[PDB]
């Protein structure tokens, strides 16, 4: 009923104070693509307040009845920012039993030692003034407003028109639900990029593509390795050495060599764990160790030392691994022999193969490893990057 669109997070409306003194019943429907946003705020005397907000895609109901801030997490199997309509029901009875109903799932919670809820400010819907965020209750996570569609707002036998009954409107607000008209299709992002739906369009996660730009169509950061060999080393701050159950690696390359090491991830001294991306007999492959036997996975059918650009993508889950060159079928490997799951205490990323006795010659582009765009960081002179030998940035 009467959908209204908040086109930006910063947009909100202010209605007359919600009266929820001895009991409360709120209902509304929402539709959004964003993970975070303040949907509803009303404060009162002393520390009294209510808040409804999305946090990481989940509906949170935060409140203070006068004896301390409390949080109820609405129950859902999925995050709710899926561009689908969701029903939200929030009630409080006279004994202070709260109920939160998100679609079909019910969550209940009682507050002991509380009396009544004394709300006094206007009721803010969609967000608040930008300078209000800094004096929000500590338990409230929102630093920005809600973006999306609200409909059927029921404040307990009070059915306001969010536009006509508003005492104040801020920013871009319309009647109707103006959802995204350009939605994520299979070919929205190039080069196997992951399409992420936004409110006014889409963006692309290019992490595993070796490419950059808004559509994963632009060349990634590139270095060239020439005569004599070179090396780019990333060393983790000794305290921030990660240990992982799952690894993700992507890089683009061009070369004519039939033997070389491109990337090696090593654990610190006295530990045997490592991850190695290499070319053997003109075929790209990965060898790794997470505590027992070496595990090898190879694309044995694609000859990749033709001097043409290629993309390689590697995933590890415990002992399990996948490898894919370009658009060839994905290679899967499930270990022979017994295995552990953690890649312990990762200390260095060595790019160029010189120290491993297999120097790389050619170009490397858009290296990504567990959140780290390593070649980008080298280009931006990160303090944990060391570059030696015959290596240069393709500017
Ligand atoms: C590896 O693969 C097996 C078989 O599909 C699966 O059951 C297991 O959970 C996987 N292990 C890890 C650590 O992902
Ligand atoms: Ca290990």
Residue numbers in the entry: 867 to 1261
Relevant lines from the article:
In the present paper, we provide for the first time a description of the crystal structure of an ectodomain fragment corresponding to the third neurexin motif of bovine α-Nrx (NX1α(III)), encompassing the domains LNS5-EGF3-LNS6. The NX1α(III) structure, refined at 2.3 Å resolution, contained one molecule in the asymmetric unit, including the LNS5 domain (residues 867–1045), the EGF domain (residues 1046–1084), and the LNS6 domain (residues 1085–1261). The central EGF domain was sandwiched between the two LNS domains and physically separated them, thereby making the entire molecule look like an off-centered dumbbell or “handset”. In contrast, the N-terminal extension from the G1086TTYIF sequence of the LNS6 domain in NX1α(III) emanate away from the domain almost perpendicularly, due to a kink at Pro1085. Consistent with previous reports that Nrx1β has the potential to bind Ca2+ at the hyper-variable surface of the LNS6 domain, we found a clear electron density peak at this site. The Ca2+ coordination assumed an octahedral geometry, as opposed to a more typical pentagonal bipyramid, using two side-chain oxygen molecules, two main-chain oxygen molecules (Asp1139, Val1156, Ile1208, and Asn1210), and two water molecules (right). The side-chain of Trp1065 was deeply inserted into a cave at the top of the LNS5 created by the Cys1015–Cys1043 disulfide and the interdomain linker, resulting in numerous van der Waals contacts and hydrogen bonds with more than 10 residues in the LNS5 domain alone (left). The interdomain contact observed between the EGF3 and LNS6 domains was similarly extensive and buried 832 Å2 of ASA, although the nature of the interaction was drastically different from that seen in LNS5-EGF3 (right).
